[PDB]
Amino acid sequence: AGTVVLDDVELREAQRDYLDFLDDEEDQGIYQSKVRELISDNQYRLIVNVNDLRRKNEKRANRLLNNAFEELVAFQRALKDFVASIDATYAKQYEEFYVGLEGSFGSKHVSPRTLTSCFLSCVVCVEGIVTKCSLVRPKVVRSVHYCPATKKTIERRYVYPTKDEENNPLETEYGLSVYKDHQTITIQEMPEKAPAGQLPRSVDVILDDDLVDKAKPGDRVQVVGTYRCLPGTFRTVLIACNVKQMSKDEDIAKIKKFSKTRSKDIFDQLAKSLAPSIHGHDYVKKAILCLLLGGVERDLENGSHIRGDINILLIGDPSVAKSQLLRYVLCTAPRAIPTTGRGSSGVGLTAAVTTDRRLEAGAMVLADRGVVCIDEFDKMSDMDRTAIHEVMEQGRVTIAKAGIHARLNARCSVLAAANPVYGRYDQYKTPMENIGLQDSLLSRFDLLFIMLDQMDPEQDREISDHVLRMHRYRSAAFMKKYIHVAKIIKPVLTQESATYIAEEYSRLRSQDSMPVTARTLETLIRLATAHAKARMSKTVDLQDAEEAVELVQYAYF
Amino acid sequence: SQVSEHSIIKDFTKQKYPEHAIHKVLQLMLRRGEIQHRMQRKVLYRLK
């Protein structure tokens, strides 16, 4: 704006109070040490805990949170003064310092759903995952114009001044002009907590300098800033002051005590807990239990290799729960998003939006460190087929447009299902081509179950009738609590246990000699990890590892 | 070659297969992402 007040006493009092806060003399000088760190490290944004501001003066914190603009400006001026007093030269180097807010906020810590209009002109915090994102452009904030004719200099804050007072030419002094970078991003509420009934709230976030590269599309970010309004269409925007990444990852104690392994074998019922109304395919249940669990990050130093990106494909005959099992995972989904068929929503596409060219992250990106449910895999087009092959291997999606080159994190897993177009039995011809998918994609997946309806009336009869009797005329939530605790477990391997896996692995190697053996060695890490994750044990049990060996044998039948 | 799209239909009729068959297979194998379908996508995009 540029409009100022002439010796405001309230502004002066705010400046004095914040300056007193900054000069922590009676305390150890924690913020003063932070000022030293920022001066040395060449960063010009000081993050101040709000809890300290409450402790020193609740009135200051209250007036800040209720009227963001003036208090923020005053506190910025206070920071400038304090820096100059400690070191004038560093202050002379830069134009204006910015201040960020972190800590704990009582009632202003909201969600995009919660962020109604009532929080206008108040500092807010928003939690979610980035959806749309735009490129880095420079935005002008102070343009310096010099007139060669009149020998005068004109400076303006923020059409562009092109003619002087008397239409003389104006050649701008670019160097004296200040340009700051700018970026437009968006956010959506978290998948698990936003109800699926009502419409989603999208909030626009504008980032100033030192914020363009701190958050990238697809991550999980907390944004704190001023919720202002631009001037027939009225749109809310959020000018941000601090961006921090997120994704680090009660009755639990009762759950923990109930889930002690010393009582009985919970794994027997645990596997059945996912397919309540499906008889048989118990091996499939174990694999599906495996897919949800398992680690998704390994400390692969000075490089990268196979990680928790392990996934399961399901191709089989219709009505064999191939379509149905996906819904069971989707219903009890820890951080999982559904997608099916073509799904032309830009897995990494921009759609080339004109009069604007934002980067709309797709389904696989929104599901970072989760599980993705995909129906009718063969329905996806070759355009996706080319992209989807690379995603699973390296773990990121490459966006290739004219000038826009960036990879989004895709630390993800896939649970894919596709109908065998017209294939009926898939027993005489090799599944490598009978499923249509001849591509090398098949090798990438860990598991490929074939759910044929072989005429087995003894086993088949029980599936038809007993499922109908499951109504029970005369524990869904449990797994939810389990998986959250299991996610923070890193079941380290034991060499004596590890050798036991190789010892029986030899017998399988000669069995399949007469399906890839070169990858099977790596997936043995996952399978052993899954069993210990069920027991929350830090070490793999040999008996548990034994069932891992059996699973590979059951894997190919 | 020589077994292009304009003559493959008549082969089914020669085998006493009416026009009903061509929809079930011929019109469905190209939608599968067959190389022959991709062959038309690149070579015949402007050449026709």
């Binding site: 219709p318 009505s319 109908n419 177009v421 017209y422 | 929809h23 079930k24 469905l28």
Partner: peptide, 20 residues
């Protein structure tokens, strides 16, 4: 439409009834 009677949706038919 003018398993032998399937044009492009060999799944929708399973979801309906065979009604004349």
């Amino acid at each position: 439409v003018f398993e032998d009677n399937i044009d492009f949706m060999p799944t929708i038919l399973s979801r309906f009834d065979m009604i004349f």
